[PDB]
Coordinates of N, CA and C and ligand atoms in Angstrom, one line a residue:
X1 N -22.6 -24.2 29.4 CA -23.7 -24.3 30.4 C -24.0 -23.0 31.0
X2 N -24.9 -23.1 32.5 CA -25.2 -21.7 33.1 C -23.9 -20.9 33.5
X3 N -23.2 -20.3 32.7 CA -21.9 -20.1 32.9 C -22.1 -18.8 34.4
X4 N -21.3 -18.5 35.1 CA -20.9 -17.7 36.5 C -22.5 -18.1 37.1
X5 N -23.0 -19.5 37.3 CA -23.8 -20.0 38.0 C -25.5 -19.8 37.4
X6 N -25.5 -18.8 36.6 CA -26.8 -18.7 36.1 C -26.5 -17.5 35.0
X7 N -25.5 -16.6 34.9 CA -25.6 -15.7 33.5 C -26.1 -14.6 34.1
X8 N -26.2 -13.4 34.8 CA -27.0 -12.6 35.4 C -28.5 -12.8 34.8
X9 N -29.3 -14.3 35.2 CA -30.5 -14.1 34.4 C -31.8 -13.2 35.5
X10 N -31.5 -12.8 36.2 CA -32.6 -11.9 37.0 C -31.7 -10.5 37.0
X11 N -32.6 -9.6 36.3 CA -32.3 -8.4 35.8 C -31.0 -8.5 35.0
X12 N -30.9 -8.0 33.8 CA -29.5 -7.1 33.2 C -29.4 -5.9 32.6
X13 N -30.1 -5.6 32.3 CA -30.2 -3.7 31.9 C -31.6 -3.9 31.3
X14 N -31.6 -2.3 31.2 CA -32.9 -1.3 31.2 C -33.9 -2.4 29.9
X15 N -33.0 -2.5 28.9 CA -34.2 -4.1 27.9 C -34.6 -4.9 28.9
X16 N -34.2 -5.4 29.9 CA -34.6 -6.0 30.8 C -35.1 -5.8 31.9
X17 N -35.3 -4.5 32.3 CA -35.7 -4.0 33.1 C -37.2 -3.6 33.0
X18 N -37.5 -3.3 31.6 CA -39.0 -2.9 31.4 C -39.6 -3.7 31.9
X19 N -39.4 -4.8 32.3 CA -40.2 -6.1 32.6 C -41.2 -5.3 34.1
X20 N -40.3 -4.9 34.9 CA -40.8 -3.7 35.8 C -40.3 -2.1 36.1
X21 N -39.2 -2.0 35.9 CA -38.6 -0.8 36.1 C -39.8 0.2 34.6
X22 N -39.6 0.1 33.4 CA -40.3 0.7 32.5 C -39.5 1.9 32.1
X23 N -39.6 2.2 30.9 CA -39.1 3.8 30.7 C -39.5 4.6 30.6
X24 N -40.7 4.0 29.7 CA -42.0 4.7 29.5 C -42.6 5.7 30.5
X25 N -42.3 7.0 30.7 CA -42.3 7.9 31.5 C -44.1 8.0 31.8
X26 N -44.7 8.3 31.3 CA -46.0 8.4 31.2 C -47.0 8.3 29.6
X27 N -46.2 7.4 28.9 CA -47.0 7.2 27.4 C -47.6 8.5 26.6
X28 N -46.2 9.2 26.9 CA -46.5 10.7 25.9 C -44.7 11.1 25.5
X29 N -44.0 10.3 25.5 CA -42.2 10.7 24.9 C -42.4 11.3 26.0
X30 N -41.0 12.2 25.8 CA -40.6 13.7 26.5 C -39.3 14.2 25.8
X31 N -38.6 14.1 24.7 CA -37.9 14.3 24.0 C -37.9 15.9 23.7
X32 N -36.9 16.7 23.6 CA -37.4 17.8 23.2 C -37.5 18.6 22.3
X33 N -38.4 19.5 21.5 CA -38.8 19.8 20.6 C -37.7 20.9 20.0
X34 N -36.7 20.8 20.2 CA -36.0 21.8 19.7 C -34.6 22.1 20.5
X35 N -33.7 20.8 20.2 CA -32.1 20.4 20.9 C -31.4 22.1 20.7
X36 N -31.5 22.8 19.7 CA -30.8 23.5 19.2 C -30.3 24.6 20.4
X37 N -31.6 24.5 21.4 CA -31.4 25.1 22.6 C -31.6 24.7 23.9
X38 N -30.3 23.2 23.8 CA -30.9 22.7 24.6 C -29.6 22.9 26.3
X39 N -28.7 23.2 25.9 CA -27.8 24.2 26.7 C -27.9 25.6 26.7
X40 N -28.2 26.2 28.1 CA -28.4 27.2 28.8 C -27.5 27.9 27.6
X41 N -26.0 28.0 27.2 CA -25.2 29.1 26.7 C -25.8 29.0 25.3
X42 N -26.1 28.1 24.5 CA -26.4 28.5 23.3 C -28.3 28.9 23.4
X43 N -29.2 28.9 24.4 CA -30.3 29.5 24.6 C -30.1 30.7 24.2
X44 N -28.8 31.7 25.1 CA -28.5 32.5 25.2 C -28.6 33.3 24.0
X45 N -27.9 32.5 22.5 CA -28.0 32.8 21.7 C -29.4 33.5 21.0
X46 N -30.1 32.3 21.2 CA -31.7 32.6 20.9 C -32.2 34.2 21.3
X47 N -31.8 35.0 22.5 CA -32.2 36.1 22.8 C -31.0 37.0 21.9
X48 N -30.6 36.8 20.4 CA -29.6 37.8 20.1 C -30.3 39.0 19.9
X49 N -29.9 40.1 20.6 CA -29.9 41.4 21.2 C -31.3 41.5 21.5
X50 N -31.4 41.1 22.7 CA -32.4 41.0 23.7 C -33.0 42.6 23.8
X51 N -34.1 42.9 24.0 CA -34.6 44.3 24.0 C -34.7 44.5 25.8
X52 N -34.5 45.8 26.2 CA -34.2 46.3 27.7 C -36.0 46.3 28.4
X53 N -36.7 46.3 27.2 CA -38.4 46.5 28.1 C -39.1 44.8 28.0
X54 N -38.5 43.8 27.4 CA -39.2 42.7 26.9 C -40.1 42.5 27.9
X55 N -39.8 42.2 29.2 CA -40.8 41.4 30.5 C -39.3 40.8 31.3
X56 N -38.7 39.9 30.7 CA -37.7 39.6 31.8 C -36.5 39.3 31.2
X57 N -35.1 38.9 32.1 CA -34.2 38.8 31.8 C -34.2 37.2 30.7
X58 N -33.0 37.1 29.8 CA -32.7 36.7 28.7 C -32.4 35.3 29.0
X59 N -31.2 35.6 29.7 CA -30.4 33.9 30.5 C -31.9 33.3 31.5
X60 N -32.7 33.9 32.2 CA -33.1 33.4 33.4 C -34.5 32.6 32.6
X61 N -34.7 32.9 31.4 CA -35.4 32.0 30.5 C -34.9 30.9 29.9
X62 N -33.7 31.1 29.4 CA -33.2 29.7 29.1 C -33.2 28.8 30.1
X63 N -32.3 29.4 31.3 CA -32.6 28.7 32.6 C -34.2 28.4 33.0
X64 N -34.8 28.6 32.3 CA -36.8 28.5 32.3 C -36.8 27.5 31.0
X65 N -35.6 27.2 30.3 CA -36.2 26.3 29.2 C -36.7 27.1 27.6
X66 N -36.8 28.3 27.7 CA -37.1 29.2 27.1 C -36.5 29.4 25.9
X67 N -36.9 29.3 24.0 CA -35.9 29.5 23.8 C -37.2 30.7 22.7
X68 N -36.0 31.4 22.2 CA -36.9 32.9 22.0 C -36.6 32.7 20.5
X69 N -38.1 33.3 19.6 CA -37.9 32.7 18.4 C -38.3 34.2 17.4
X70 N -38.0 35.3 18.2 CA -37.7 36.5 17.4 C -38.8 37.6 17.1
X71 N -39.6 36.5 18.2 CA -41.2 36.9 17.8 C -41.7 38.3 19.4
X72 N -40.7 39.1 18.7 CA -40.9 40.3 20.1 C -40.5 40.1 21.8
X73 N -41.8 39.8 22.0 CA -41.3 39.5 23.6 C -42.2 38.2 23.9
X74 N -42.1 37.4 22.9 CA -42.6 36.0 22.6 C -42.2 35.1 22.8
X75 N -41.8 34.3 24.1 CA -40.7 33.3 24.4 C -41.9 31.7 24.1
X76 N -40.8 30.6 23.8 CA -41.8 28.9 23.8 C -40.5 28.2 24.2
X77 N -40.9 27.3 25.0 CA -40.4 26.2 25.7 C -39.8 25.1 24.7
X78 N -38.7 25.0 24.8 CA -38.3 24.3 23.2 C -38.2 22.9 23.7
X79 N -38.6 22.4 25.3 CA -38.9 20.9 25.6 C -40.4 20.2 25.3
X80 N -41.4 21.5 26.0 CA -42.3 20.5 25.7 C -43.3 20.6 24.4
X81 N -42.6 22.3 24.4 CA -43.4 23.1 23.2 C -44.4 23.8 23.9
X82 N -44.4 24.7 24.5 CA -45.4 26.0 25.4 C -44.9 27.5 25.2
X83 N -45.4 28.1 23.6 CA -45.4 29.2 23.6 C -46.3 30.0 24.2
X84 N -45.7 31.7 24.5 CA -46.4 32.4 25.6 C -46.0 33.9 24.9
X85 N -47.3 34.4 25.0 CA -46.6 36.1 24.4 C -48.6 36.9 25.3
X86 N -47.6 38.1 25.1 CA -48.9 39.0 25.1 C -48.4 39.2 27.4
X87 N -47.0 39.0 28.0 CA -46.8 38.7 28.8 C -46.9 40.5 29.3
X88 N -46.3 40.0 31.3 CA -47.0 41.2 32.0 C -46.5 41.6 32.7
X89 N -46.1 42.3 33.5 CA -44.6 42.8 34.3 C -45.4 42.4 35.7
X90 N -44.8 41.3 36.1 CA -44.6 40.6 37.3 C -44.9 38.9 37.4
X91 N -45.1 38.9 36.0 CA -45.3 37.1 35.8 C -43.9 36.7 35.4
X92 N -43.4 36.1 36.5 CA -42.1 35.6 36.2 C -41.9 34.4 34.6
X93 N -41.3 35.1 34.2 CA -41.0 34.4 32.7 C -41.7 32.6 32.8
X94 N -40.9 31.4 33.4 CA -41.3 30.1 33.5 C -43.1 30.3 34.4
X95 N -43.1 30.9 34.9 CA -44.2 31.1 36.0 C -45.7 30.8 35.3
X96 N -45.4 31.4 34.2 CA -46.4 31.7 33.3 C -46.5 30.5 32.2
X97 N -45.3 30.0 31.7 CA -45.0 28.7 31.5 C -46.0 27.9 31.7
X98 N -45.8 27.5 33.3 CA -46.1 26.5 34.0 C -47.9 26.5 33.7
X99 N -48.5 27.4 33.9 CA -49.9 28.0 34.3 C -50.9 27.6 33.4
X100 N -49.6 28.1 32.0 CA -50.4 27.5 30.6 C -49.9 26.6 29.9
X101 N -49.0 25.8 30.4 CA -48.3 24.2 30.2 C -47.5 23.9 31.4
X102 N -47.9 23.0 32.2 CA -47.7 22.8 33.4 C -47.4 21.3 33.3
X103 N -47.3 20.8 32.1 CA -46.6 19.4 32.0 C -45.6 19.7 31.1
X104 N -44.6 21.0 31.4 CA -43.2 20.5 31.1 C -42.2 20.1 32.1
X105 N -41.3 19.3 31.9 CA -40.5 17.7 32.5 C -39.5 18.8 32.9
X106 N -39.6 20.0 32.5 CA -38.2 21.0 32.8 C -38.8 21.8 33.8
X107 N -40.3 22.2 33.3 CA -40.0 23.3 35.0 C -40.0 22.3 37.0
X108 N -41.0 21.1 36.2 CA -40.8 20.4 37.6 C -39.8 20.1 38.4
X109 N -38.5 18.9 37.9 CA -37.6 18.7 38.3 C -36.5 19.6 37.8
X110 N -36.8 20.7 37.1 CA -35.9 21.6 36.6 C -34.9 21.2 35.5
X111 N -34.4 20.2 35.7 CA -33.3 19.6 34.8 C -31.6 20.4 35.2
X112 N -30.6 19.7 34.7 CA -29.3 19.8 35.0 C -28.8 19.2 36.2
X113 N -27.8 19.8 36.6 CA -26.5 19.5 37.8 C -28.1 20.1 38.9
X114 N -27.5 21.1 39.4 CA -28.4 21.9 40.2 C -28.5 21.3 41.6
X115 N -28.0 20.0 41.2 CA -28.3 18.9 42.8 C -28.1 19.6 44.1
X116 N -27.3 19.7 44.6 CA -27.5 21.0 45.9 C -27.7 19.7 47.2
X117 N -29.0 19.0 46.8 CA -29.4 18.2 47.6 C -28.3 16.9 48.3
Ligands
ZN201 ZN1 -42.0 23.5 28.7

């Protein structure tokens, strides 16, 4: 029968939850285009031997989501997919990101620990 009085039948997880909760972020995925750099240390990698004039530092791009595909001083966003080159000494690396893809899920809420709050 209704076993522990009813079964948890009002809500039981997220299959159940779509009913209102939803996951569907905004009916476009958000998955990312390229896991391979999807930790800050192996981004790192991406910048192997980073040149000293590129535009900006190496790490502070991955920390930007940034992952660098060898193409000079050509960095793309390996979440949402927002490549960027032809850059300018004072446009901070993500900054520029944002301006010409400003729907990535990473520069808004940033992503990681970071909580502070
Ligand atoms: Zn992005």
């Amino acid at each position: 029968r209704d076993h522990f009085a009813l079964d948890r039948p009002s809500e039981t997880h997220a299959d159940y939850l779509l009913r209102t909760g939803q996951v569907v972020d905004i009916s476009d995925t958000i998955y990312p285009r390229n896991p391979a750099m999807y930790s800050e240390e192996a981004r790192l990698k991406s910048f192997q031997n980073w040149p000293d004039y590129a535009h900006l530092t190496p790490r502070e791009l991955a920390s930007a989501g940034l992952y660098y595909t060898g193409i000079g001083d050509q960095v793309q966003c390996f979440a949402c997919g927002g490549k960027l080159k032809n850059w300018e000494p004072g446009d901070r690396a993500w900054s520029e990101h944002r301006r010409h893809f400003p729907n990535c899920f990473f520069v808004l809420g940033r992503n990681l620990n970071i909580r502070s709050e």
